């Protein structure tokens, strides 16, 4: 829903959300082909 948000937050007023007590599924992120730059710093994308 963060990725599907119709109107994203402004670049200066970037929305910060703390998420926990759930299961993070990164498989859908890999499956989606819309992403152009998926650079990861300090962590392997595969081991997410």
């Amino acid at each position: 829903e963060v990725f599907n948000a119709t109107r994203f937050a402004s670049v200066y007023a970037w929305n910060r959300k703390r998420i926990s007590n759930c299961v993070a599924d990164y498989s859908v992120l890999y499956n989606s082909a819309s992403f152009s730059t998926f650079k990861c710093y300090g962590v392997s994308p595969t081991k997410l």
């Epitope: 989606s32 082909a33 152009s36 300090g42 392997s44 595969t46």
Partner: antibody, heavy 116, light 112 residues
Framework: EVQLKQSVAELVRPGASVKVSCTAS????????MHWVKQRPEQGLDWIGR????????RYAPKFQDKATITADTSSNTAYLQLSSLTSEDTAIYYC?????????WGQGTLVTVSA | DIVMTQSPSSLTVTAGEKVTMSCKSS????????????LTWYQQKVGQPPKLLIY???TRDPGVPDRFTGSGFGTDFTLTISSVQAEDLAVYYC?????????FGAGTKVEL
Amino acid sequence: EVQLKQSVAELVRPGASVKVSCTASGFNIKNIYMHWVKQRPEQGLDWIGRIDPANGNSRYAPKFQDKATITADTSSNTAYLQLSSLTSEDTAIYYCADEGWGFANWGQGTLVTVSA
Amino acid sequence: DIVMTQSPSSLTVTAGEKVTMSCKSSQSLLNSGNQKNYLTWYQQKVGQPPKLLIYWASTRDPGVPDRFTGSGFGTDFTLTISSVQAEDLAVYYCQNDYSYPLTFGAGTKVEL
């Protein structure tokens, strides 16, 4: 940022074993299954193999199978590369990796030199 | 095991001139879901290890990002540079990533 400071190259003798340790800063190895790569001078660079911190189950290139064994340390922010039956061809530069879409950060370079 | 052949000979070019180099990739590197090819370019000088020039076959890495955009469906890849500078005087490596057994290319030397 993030840097890979592998151990300085040291002289080795033929028929012996060498352990090369790569250190990382800004994160921990636990989320990084670093690759290992050697660059043969005046020749196309080639990939050695892959390891994992937990359940390493290392897989290497077919040319380096059963010859280059690499182990990953769970702690100390280090990983060790072991070699055996080193020859003159084995004198090459080695680098580390961050197993991104490409090898994001490589080692400074180690010349594993076999001589007398 | 994929045989990767880059441009064999060095391409002597004048400063600020376009270069046409390409490495042919076999096995038709493609992945399900994401259409981005799993071939990543590299930029290696004499003295320091190579760094990612392009990954996913089209993604400008931060730092000296003068084009490097590549148009390829998997069988062929291109890394044309419109203008070559001091930082562009290096050897470029194209490496496959979709196949688990991966090997790098021979290398292409470009100088001003």
